[PDB]
Amino acid sequence: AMYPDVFAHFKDFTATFGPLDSLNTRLFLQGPKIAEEFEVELERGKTLHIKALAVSDLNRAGQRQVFFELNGQLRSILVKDTQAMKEMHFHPKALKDVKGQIGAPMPGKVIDIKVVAGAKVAKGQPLCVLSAMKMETVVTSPMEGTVRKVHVTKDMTLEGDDLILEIE
């Protein structure tokens, strides 16, 4: 009620990155150092140890991998490097909030497209053919409009909710 914006912001930070304030001062602001054991007190009941093993090199569109070991086991984590943000990877993102952008709810490969850009289309008619693991998925047109320009044509891999067509 008093600070809505920062309360909403804080609520999402402590979710994506988990609970905090149980760490050491070095861990919170500086972070762990390679090849030195540090302790994290989670709850009164349990308590667990970590080593930082090594940090790999950047591989694909800025996704570096780091090697941690939890108490008694080795672990691997992929972290998105946000310091580069120089390359243009295209692959437009179709947000579900915006009606104009059209995205695929399931990642896969496009089989066929039955609609050509800037042409007359019907309401609630099949427009693309999608392939699943062992099923056929038929997309139905949600609403009637016009597509201005299509960048991704065919025969290329897309992930979930990617922009191929923009409806108006």
Binding site: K46, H49, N71
Partner: peptide, 13 residues
């Protein structure tokens, strides 16, 4: 014996 697996399958340690 801090890296053993017996202390990880219990609620309290």
């Amino acid at each position: 014996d801090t890296g053993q697996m017996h202390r990880q399958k219990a609620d309290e340690a």
